[PDB]
Amino acid sequence: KHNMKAFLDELKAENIKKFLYNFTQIPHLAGTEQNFQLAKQIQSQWKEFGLDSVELAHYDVLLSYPNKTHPNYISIINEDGNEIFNTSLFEPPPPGYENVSDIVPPFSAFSPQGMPEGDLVYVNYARTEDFFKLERDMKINCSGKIVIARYGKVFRGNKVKNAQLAGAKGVILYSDPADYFAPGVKSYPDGWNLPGGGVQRGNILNLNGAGDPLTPGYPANEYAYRRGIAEAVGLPSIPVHPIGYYDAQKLLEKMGGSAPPDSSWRGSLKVPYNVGPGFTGNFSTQKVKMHIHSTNEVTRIYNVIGTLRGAVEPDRYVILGGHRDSWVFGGIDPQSGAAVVHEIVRSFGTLKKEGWRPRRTILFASWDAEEFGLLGSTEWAEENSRLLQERGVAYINADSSIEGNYTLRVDCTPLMYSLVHNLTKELKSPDEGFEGKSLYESWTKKSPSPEFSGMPRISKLGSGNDFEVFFQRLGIASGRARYTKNWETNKFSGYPLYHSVYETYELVEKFYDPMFKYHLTVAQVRGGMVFELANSIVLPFDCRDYAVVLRKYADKIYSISMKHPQEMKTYSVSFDSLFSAVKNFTEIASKFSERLQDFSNPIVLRMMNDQLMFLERAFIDPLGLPDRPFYRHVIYAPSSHNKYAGESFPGIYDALFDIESKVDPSKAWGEVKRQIYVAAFTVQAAAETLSEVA
Amino acid sequence: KHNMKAFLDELKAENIKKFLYNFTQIPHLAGTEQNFQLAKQIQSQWKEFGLDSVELAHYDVLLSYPNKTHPNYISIINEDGNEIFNTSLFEPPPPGYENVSDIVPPFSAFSPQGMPEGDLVYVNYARTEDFFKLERDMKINCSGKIVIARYGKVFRGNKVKNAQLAGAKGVILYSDPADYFAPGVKSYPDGWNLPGGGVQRGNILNLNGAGDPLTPGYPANEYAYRRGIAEAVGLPSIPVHPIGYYDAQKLLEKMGGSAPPDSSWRGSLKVPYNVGPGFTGNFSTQKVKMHIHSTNEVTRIYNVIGTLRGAVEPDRYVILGGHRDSWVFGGIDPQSGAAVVHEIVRSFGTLKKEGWRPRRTILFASWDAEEFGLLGSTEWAEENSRLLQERGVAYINADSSIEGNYTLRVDCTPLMYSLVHNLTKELKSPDEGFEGKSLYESWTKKSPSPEFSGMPRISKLGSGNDFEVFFQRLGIASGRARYTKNWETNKFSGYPLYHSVYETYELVEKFYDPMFKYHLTVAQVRGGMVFELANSIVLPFDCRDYAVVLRKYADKIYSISMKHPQEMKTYSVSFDSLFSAVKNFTEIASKFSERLQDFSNPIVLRMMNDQLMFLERAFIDPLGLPDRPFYRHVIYAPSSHNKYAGESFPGIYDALFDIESKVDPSKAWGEVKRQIYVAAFTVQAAAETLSEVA
Ligand SMILES: *[C@@H]1O[C@H](CO)[C@@H](O[C@@H]2O[C@H](CO)[C@@H](O[C@@H]3O[C@H](CO)[C@@H](O)[C@H](O[C@H]4O[C@H](CO)[C@@H](O)[C@H](O)[C@@H]4O)[C@@H]3O)[C@H](O)[C@H]2NC(C)=O)[C@H](O)[C@H]1NC(C)=O
Numbered sequence A, B: 001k002h003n004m005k006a007f008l009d010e011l012k013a014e015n016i017k018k019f020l021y022n023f024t025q026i027p028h029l030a031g032t033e034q035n036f037q038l039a040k041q042i043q044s045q046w047k048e049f050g051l052d053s054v055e056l057a058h059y060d061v062l063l064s065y066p067n068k069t070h071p072n073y074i075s076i077i078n079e080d081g082n083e084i085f086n087t088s089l090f091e092p093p094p095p096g097y098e099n100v101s102d103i104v105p106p107f108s109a110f111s112p113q114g115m116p117e118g119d120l121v122y123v124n125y126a127r128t129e130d131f132f133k134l135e136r137d138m139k140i141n142c143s144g145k146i147v148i149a150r151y152g153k154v155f156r157g158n159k160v161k162n163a164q165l166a167g168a169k170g171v172i173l174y175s176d177p178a179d180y181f182a183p184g185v186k187s188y189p190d191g192w193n194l195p196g197g198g199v200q201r202g203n204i205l206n207l208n209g210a211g212d213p214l215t216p217g218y219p220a221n222e223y224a225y226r227r228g229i230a231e232a233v234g235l236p237s238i239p240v241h242p243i244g245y246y247d248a249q250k251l252l253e254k255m256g257g258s259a260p261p262d263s264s265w266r267g268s269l270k271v272p273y274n275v276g277p278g279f280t281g282n283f284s285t286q287k288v289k290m291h292i293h294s295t296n297e298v299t300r301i302y303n304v305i306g307t308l309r310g311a312v313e314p315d316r317y318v319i320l321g322g323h324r325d326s327w328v329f330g331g332i333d334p335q336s337g338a339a340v341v342h343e344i345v346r347s348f349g350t351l352k353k354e355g356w357r358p359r360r361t362i363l364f365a366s367w368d369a370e371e372f373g374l375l376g377s378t379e380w381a382e383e384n385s386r387l388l389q390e391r392g393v394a395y396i397n398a399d400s401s402i403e404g405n406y407t408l409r410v411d412c413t414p415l416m417y418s419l420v421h422n423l424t425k426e427l428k429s430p431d432e433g434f435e436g437k438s439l440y441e442s443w444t445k446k447s448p449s450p451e452f453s454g455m456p457r458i459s460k461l462g463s464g465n466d467f468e469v470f471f472q473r474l475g476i477a478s479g480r481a482r483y484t485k486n487w488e489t490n491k492f493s494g495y496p497l498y499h500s501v502y503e504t505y506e507l508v509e510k511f512y513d514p515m516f517k518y519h520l521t522v523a524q525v526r527g528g529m530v531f532e533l534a535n536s537i538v539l540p541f542d543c544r545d546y547a548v549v550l551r552k553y554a555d556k557i558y559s560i561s562m563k564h565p566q567e568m569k570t571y572s573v574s575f576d577s578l579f580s581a582v583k584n585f586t587e588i589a590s591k592f593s594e595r596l597q598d599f600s601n602p603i604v605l606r607m608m609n610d611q612l613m614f615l616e617r618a619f620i621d622p623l624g625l626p627d628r629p630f631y632r633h634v635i636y637a638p639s640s641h642n643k644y645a646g647e648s649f650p651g652i653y654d655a656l657f658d659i660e661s662k663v664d665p666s667k668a669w670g671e672v673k674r675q676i677y678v679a680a681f682t683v684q685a686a687a688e689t690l691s692e693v694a
């Protein structure tokens, strides 16, 4: 038999281990030769594994690199302009590497050049609420200051945006042990914690879905017209650089001015966490000076695209994609995911060699330049947008397979909730203490739904990975799954060695998953999802699950608005249309479900498969959200305050956010009303796609 | 047998005549009770005729009406402010009407109110080139002047836009006998010419595809948020009013200043056609004063939507639509079209009652408020956009069936060229002298293709009718056909009694088509097209015909650019990518055609039917054209200088237009290059939708 069990049993922990080792011996930074060589290797192997075609799709996109002969660093400078302290020029390499070349030093990708000097202000996590506290409550002015912010809580590009709008002239990001050092575990190489010399790389763009900064809307192909740098999308206007906590301690220890406003502003270092501005009495005349010399450069990137043609519906695509480019060795991010995808391709190819083909076409992607802003996936989707929006069934992402060893973490469209529950009930739990129990059982026990008893937590999709263009721009049903930790307040912060030189094969093999059983479990979840999507006769989506969450999101946004009852009275702000639409959606979805259960007729089936495929597509508004034209889904967008987090009813959410501070309340509440209309209309229009067609 | 011949033979000239009479006894102005009553009648009859469902879809949109107790008119005013001449307050009603009430007086719909007074400048047809001649060559300044312009050549809303940008403070439109009085024929009621008291109504909006001015992007339903009037789309900023040639003679006879620059500026009245500004010596102190008091008002409109569910592909829609609202009696515009649609529905219903159903679903529409800016069709399409873009096969328009009695006129997508040629070869010519010959033969003889021997002329779709939203916004294959005159320079001007009170049943029955044989022929062309689209197993589109025209349009836009060889050198302006894309499109389209001819497999068929349906859809750019977000088709848009005319490669065309006058040539040619990239990319992406799917 060639069924899902055949597929799942063919997957081997030992193969994933071998591939992980193979993918993590040298750095694979986007735009470098080593990363092109790995692309060619994967293309060759996917051919050998049995795919019908495997091609490289290349693009020429804006990337950013430090200057090898003019290093970035930060100084404390004295009255005379003597640099009395300098931050490190590189992370101490881990054991046995120390002679690896081409390890890119820590830098903030896309920082402009500059040598700003000034007084420090400490801004906690540099969140919107942190700046509100500084400016509104503490009356501290960041204008012309260098801000220092700890990593964690929100995407770093939002920190930099917030610092810019506060008038900062530079930003220093650092890793506090409060957020990157788990109590009781040892620093790398003796455990999985971040050493004091470790630093988190990462880009600081605010692309809002655009892809390559120079070519928003269109692929960066050979004849592309590029914007000038001054009109590029998303580039920061002030210099930015990341440091480790040994260096941060040196910059923070002398800080003066106001005390931290409360304990949620204090990290774990032995410093006061004074907000500043500037240093205490004796050092009041010393300044901080940044030296940033990185350059932005148009550089070729390569996606590997493999096709397994469907036997029955070859013009319906189920896509499994994850990136290949890494900051350094990519031991977790992304190669723990890429190794899982490699083993999935191998298993599918095994079945194919025995004469099986999936019902629908499966596309496999190894994306490039994810680390520089989701560039590879976005440019490819821009190139192929018409094929994807008329043929795309679903997209399953496959970045890091593990960020912990505790339990499963899933974010996906409501359309896939039932599929995930059903699949996980059929898979074995890899967890100690749940031998012979299902993954569904361990996951539900360890990560209970906050709404429903006996169900696991599944979160909304946000952004910060390659599914963004598929879901938020194109409206293709998307999902992602991995193994995670038990550390709730660190949900968006990353594991301690995130984007550091210390993320190596050895990290994974010694400390995360020595048996590769969690990798195997994740391969079964991702692969199992792809198998069901590409093989089930009726697409495995339950429209009724969308109706349940739409009501939850409508209650939530109504509750936010109802914080302002006098204004809702004055401006006649009614949510009645949105609740009406959600009611209608619930009723129509129930009737559609009955018909779907009640029909030998392939035209009726496909008609109904097309209704299921196009339902996520119906939540797309071609006009986009306000000032964010590439975020087009009306139900979900990346939060405007934190790209990683999803926000529901984002148009209405942002119209309500901080509304009590707007100078013209009539205009502000008018825009809330406009967003309620758009949302109600889109929900009703999506409902109507599920009605009888004629 | 229930085949196309059965359908075509059931259509009767005598029924079309009876329906025309029935639809033209009282005015059916949008938003009035009489037009709602006619909607209800059509809904009832289409039910009786056999459709599966017939519903009214209503919307509340911005309309515009004169003030019944405060009439619009224009005066010549003297030194003291005595009004010494006044234009007419109404057109003399035709015989036997004179006691019809609710005939709306001539006005320009959506004019703002005002009583501007000033000196006249005569601007010929108020085209872009007419204003270029005035300002650049003759150095006449229109700022603060009232302009007087003859109707014809271009859409009146473009005239008003042009007058506004020239700084005019009011616009007077009039009908010159040069353009609205055919030599040798008598004025209504004794012939089909415009009397001197006749006046052409019409709106003067510049909506660029938006639909209701207050709700761009979204249907004007019961909970819609509306823009304030100041932010409405497309409204003119200066008062405008239309007059007949008796009145125009009075305003033009006293005109002084410069002589007309050449004979193409002179109409047929016995006046000099001096450009002005102002009157000759003796009258130099008299002025012209407008009095406009019309009001814009949100008003309910009603579309009738009938469905004939398909037997096999009910989720594929072929749409036959035309409007019902008229300025007055609508003898030609629109009821000559509406009567044809009514007879088509009757014939289809006849077949249905005998047990036949079309393969695909056919939707029939009687649109409202077409005359006020395509409002009914646009709002409906905004409401149903997701259904239309995933299910819409084709749209066939059905406004006026006749504007002459000479030969056929067709505008459609290249995808329908072969369908039109084939259908017309099977229909009888109604023409004298072509008894027993095909319509194809008479049409080709009377309207030869300018490119190809032995083929008839088929023009590009422009705008000015209800197909706009379907074609230019949504990318649904569209076409239109009617009987026309032999008067080439009057292509966009309208027949003489266009939008006048004199367009009556009697006009048609006495002077255009007493036997209703041209109406019947048009019913056979429109109905035959709908039948083939809704019934052919393989959709009747030939992608190779698009490849031929894309090459023609590429040669044309390249030729325009090559007027500027030095700039193409300086700025490295290459059309190579666009010709490459067109070459690829031609090659892939040829191979697709071979496969389409070479395949019992309904999935392969529908897969290939979907490739055919989505090919027009592939030319849509979701970002729209520059500053015209609702014109999204990259190959075709309404000309920026004349809404009625189609323009090919419009983005590149407008970037090139008058480029030698731009102040920053680097920037201007950069934008040409950007538009070449967008066009090349879109053509290649459309080509790729025709490749093998996997
Ligand atoms: C959820 O689905 C339901 C259908 O089950 C759908 O109900 C529709 O609601 C609209 C607006 O609420 C109804 O619109 C009415 O239509 C009638 C004609 O049928 C008009 O006469 C009404 O207008 C009068 O009353 C208005 C309200 O007081 C006045 O403002 C106006 O000036 C008129 O005097 C009104 O337009 C529509 O008929 C129903 N359709 C049904 C019941 O089938 C509802 O809209 C859906 N929700 C959403 C958000 O789409």
Ligand SMILES: *[C@@H]1O[C@H](CO)[C@@H](O[C@@H]2O[C@H](CO)[C@@H](O[C@@H]3O[C@H](CO)[C@@H](O)[C@H](O[C@H]4O[C@H](CO)[C@@H](O)[C@H](O)[C@@H]4O)[C@@H]3O)[C@H](O)[C@H]2NC(C)=O)[C@H](O)[C@H]1NC(C)=O
Residues within 6 Å of the ligand: A222, B577, B578, B580, B581, B584, B680, B681, B684
């Ligand atoms: C029409 O269809 C054809 C396919 O039949 C398609 O041809 C493609 O053209 C592109 C660009 O013209 C080719 O791109 C090249 O790809 C190779 C790798 O395969 C690269 O090495 C090339 O880059 C080098 O050379 C460039 C040009 O001198 C340099 O600018 C660059 O720095 C590199 O040194 C280059 O990107 C592509 O391979 C073909 N594909 C084929 C032949 O299958 C053509 O693009 C289509 N037309 C349109 C408008 O899409």
Ligand SMILES: *[C@@H]1O[C@H](CO)[C@@H](O[C@@H]2O[C@H](CO)[C@@H](O[C@@H]3O[C@H](CO)[C@@H](O)[C@H](O)[C@@H]3O)[C@H](O)[C@H]2NC(C)=O)[C@H](O)[C@H]1NC(C)=O
Residues within 6 Å of the ligand: A418, A419, A422, A540, A541, A542, A597, A598
């Ligand atoms: C996840 O698994 C559940 C449980 O198996 C699936 O739901 C079940 O799906 C089947 C097939 O539609 C349903 O069977 C149907 O029952 C009705 C009688 O009410 C009958 O008319 C049909 O012919 C058919 O037998 C079954 O009721 C349903 N069970 C429940 C509790 O909903 C579900 O579809 C799976 N989700 C997927 C595949 O996304």
Ligand SMILES: *[C@@H]1O[C@H](CO)[C@@H](O[C@@H]2O[C@H](CO)[C@@H](O[C@@H]3O[C@H](CO)[C@@H](O)[C@H](O)[C@@H]3O)[C@H](O)[C@H]2NC(C)=O)[C@H](O)[C@H]1NC(C)=O
Residues within 6 Å of the ligand: B418, B419, B422, B540, B541, B542, B597, B598
């Ligand atoms: C308009 O009418 C023309 C003429 O009938 C149609 O073109 C013809 O279409 C048929 C069906 O595809 C073609 O027949 C095929 O011929 C090939 C042999 O070359 C064979 O492999 C197929 O099995 C089939 O017999 C025919 O060649 C073709 N004629 C020409 C001159 O092109 C055309 O399709 C009609 N247009 C429509 C329906 O839009």
Ligand SMILES: O=C(O)CC[C@H](NC(=O)N[C@@H](CCCCNC(=O)c1ccc(I)cc1)C(=O)O)C(=O)O
Residues within 6 Å of the ligand: A202, A203, A333, A370, A371, A372, A373, A374, A399, A400, A409, A410, A411, A462, A463, A464, A465, A480, A481, A482, A491, A492, A493, A494, A643, A644, A645
């Ligand atoms: O430019 C971008 O948009 C992102 C590029 C790059 N992306 C990442 O590094 N993404 C990492 C980020 C981890 C930290 C935040 N994590 C999450 O949001 C998250 C949420 C749910 C799951 I299941 C898995 C991860 C990842 O998704 O694994 C970056 O964040 O620097």
Ligand SMILES: O=C(O)CC[C@H](NC(=O)N[C@@H](CCCCNC(=O)c1ccc(I)cc1)C(=O)O)C(=O)O
Residues within 6 Å of the ligand: B202, B203, B333, B370, B371, B372, B373, B374, B399, B400, B409, B410, B411, B462, B463, B464, B465, B480, B481, B482, B491, B492, B493, B494, B643, B644, B645
């Ligand atoms: O607001 C709008 O966009 C148009 C509203 C209203 N539309 C019309 O009156 N359309 C009339 C206009 C006739 C004059 C221009 N004619 C054409 O462009 C034309 C071209 C091809 C064919 I076949 C038939 C007619 C019509 O299409 O029959 C108007 O022009 O005032």
Ligand SMILES: *[C@@H]1O[C@H](CO)[C@@H](O[C@@H]2O[C@H](CO)[C@@H](O)[C@H](O)[C@H]2NC(C)=O)[C@H](O)[C@H]1NC(C)=O
Residues within 6 Å of the ligand: A021, A022, A023, A025, A040, A041, A044, A045
């Ligand atoms: C990763 O595995 C690949 C594939 O097994 C290795 O590449 C092969 O190496 C052998 C021996 O040098 C060559 O003969 C083949 O041409 C390579 N195959 C390819 C690239 O498809 C590669 O050596 C491994 N990398 C590491 C670091 O172990």
Ligand SMILES: *[C@@H]1O[C@H](CO)[C@@H](O[C@@H]2O[C@H](CO)[C@@H](O)[C@H](O)[C@H]2NC(C)=O)[C@H](O)[C@H]1NC(C)=O
Residues within 6 Å of the ligand: A075, A081, A082, A083, A084, A085, A086
């Ligand atoms: C921090 O680094 C700077 C830059 O390399 C050092 O300052 C330089 O020192 C050399 C030799 O003393 C001088 O010739 C340069 O002119 C200095 N450059 C400057 C100030 O930009 C500085 O010594 C380092 N500080 C510490 C504490 O190591």
Ligand SMILES: *[C@@H]1O[C@H](CO)[C@@H](O[C@@H]2O[C@H](CO)[C@@H](O)[C@H](O)[C@H]2NC(C)=O)[C@H](O)[C@H]1NC(C)=O
Residues within 6 Å of the ligand: B021, B022, B023, B025, B040, B041, B044, B045
């Ligand atoms: C147009 O034709 C319609 C339908 O034949 C006429 O409306 C009918 O009139 C009869 C007699 O008054 C009524 O009993 C029916 O209820 C009407 N049917 C409808 C509206 O569906 C209408 O009278 C005709 N109009 C003109 C001007 O002749």
Ligand SMILES: *[C@@H]1O[C@H](CO)[C@@H](O[C@@H]2O[C@H](CO)[C@@H](O)[C@H](O)[C@H]2NC(C)=O)[C@H](O)[C@H]1NC(C)=O
Residues within 6 Å of the ligand: B075, B081, B082, B083, B084, B085, B086
């Ligand atoms: C043009 O119409 C205007 C407006 O009705 C006429 O002017 C009015 O005439 C009456 C009676 O003579 C006066 O009471 C009003 O005050 C005038 N209103 C104005 C000037 O706005 C005028 O007589 C008409 N001219 C002609 C030639 O018929």
Ligand SMILES: *[C@@H]1O[C@H](CO)[C@@H](O)[C@H](O)[C@H]1NC(C)=O
Residues within 6 Å of the ligand: A067, A068, A069, A070, A295
């Ligand atoms: C890097 O710095 C070196 C040495 O100071 C300089 O010569 C070169 O221009 C820089 N490289 C860049 C800007 O890419």
Ligand SMILES: *[C@@H]1O[C@H](CO)[C@@H](O)[C@H](O)[C@H]1NC(C)=O
Residues within 6 Å of the ligand: A141, A142, A143, A144
């Ligand atoms: C913040 O500080 C700068 C000092 O240059 C000043 O320009 C800005 O107005 C200040 N903001 C306020 C309103 O405190």
Ligand SMILES: *[C@@H]1O[C@H](CO)[C@@H](O)[C@H](O)[C@H]1NC(C)=O
Residues within 6 Å of the ligand: A192, A404, A405, A485, A511, A512
């Ligand atoms: C793996 O699981 C054990 C047992 O709970 C835990 O103590 C250890 O820290 C985990 N490793 C990681 C990297 O989370």
Ligand SMILES: *[C@@H]1O[C@H](CO)[C@@H](O)[C@H](O)[C@H]1NC(C)=O
Residues within 6 Å of the ligand: B067, B068, B069, B070, B295
């Ligand atoms: C029309 O004019 C009359 C009489 O002058 C006036 O009372 C009324 O306000 C006007 N109607 C409108 C503006 O709709």
Ligand SMILES: *[C@@H]1O[C@H](CO)[C@@H](O)[C@H](O)[C@H]1NC(C)=O
Residues within 6 Å of the ligand: B141, B142, B143, B144
């Ligand atoms: C046209 O005339 C007006 C007179 O008020 C003037 O403001 C404008 O500059 C003139 N245009 C030119 C440049 O001749």
Ligand SMILES: *[C@@H]1O[C@H](CO)[C@@H](O)[C@H](O)[C@H]1NC(C)=O
Residues within 6 Å of the ligand: B192, B404, B405, B485, B511, B512
């Ligand atoms: C109808 O055809 C005749 C014969 O050519 C022509 O003279 C007459 O003017 C036509 N009627 C119209 C309205 O064009």
Ligand SMILES: [Ca+2]
Residues within 6 Å of the ligand: A210, A211, A212, A214, A215, A216, A217, A218, A219, A220, A379, A382
């Ligand atoms: Ca791009």
